[PDB]
């Protein structure tokens, strides 16, 4: 079991930072109490997502080196990863360890919330696939951090600067792959695979949106801005 001190430090730091903010209890239990309605579900789901985004900007604001980047690039990294990051969380939430609590009920709200079962089917297929990988909090944390820290996002001016910040996360996740699952591996390769996949999911997501209707309810200001519309 390798893992240098520099690497363990990054991991401990990232892990710390990863579990700080957390979703507000109000919005959370809002899926237990309160009930159905495609429009009510649509509002809850959209309320959380707006939350998630907020938590996400804080997490990446304290990712090693982030504030050191050009200000425009930071925006681009955020706008560029908000959706994909959301996918990773969705994955984390859905598969692995069922605390016999609200999460299985969240799936229900998602089903019939004005979302085409022609979209939820493949999407949930994906989450179940990433599930097969039997990932840990740490793997989810690093993936989220490397997803956010992608030098190949459409508008960044200085990609090397972002690279310097992402490689360390990449080196760690990989070494972490040998450790937890050496039986194969390929696992690290496959993990990076899912990272390319959800990039195409971002595309479908953008399309499913303009057809997402529910009565006439609108998304929150932030979402309209980050999800584009």
């Amino acid at each position: 079991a390798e893992l240098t001190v520099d690497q363990q430090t990054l991991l401990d730091y990232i892990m710390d930072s990863y579990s700080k903010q957390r979703m507000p209890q109000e919005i959370t239990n809002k899926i237990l109490k309160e009930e159905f309605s495609a429009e009510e579900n649509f509002l809850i789901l959209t309320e959380m997502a707006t939350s998630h985004v907020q938590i996400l900007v804080e997490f990446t604001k304290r990712l090693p080196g982030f504030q050191t980047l050009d200000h425009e690039d930071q925006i681009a990294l955020l706008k560029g990863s908000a959706v994909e990051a959301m996918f990773l969380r969705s994955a984390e939430i859905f598969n692995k360890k069922l605390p016999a609590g609200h999460a299985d009920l969240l799936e229900e709200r998602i089903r019939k919330s004005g979302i085409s079962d022609e979209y939820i089917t493949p999407m949930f297929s994906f989450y179940k696939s990433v599930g097969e990988l039997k990932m840990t909090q740490e793997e989810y944390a690093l993936l989220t951090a490397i997803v956010i820290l992608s030098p190949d996002r459409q508008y960044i001016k200085d990609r090397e600067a972002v690279e310097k910040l992402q490689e360390p996360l990449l080196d760690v996740l990989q070494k972490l792959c040998k450790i937890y699952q050496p039986e194969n591996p390929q696992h690290f390769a496959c993990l990076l695979g899912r990272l390319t996949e959800l990039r195409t999911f971002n595309h479908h997501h953008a399309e499913m949106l303009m057809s997402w209707r529910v009565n006439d309810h609108k998304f929150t200001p932030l979402l309209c801005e980050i999800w584009d519309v």
Binding site: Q74, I75, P221, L222
Partner: peptide, 12 residues
């Protein structure tokens, strides 16, 4: 423009 995002990045 991303005015909201910007605002969340500078003082939250």
């Amino acid at each position: 423009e991303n005015a909201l995002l910007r605002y969340l990045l500078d003082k939250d």
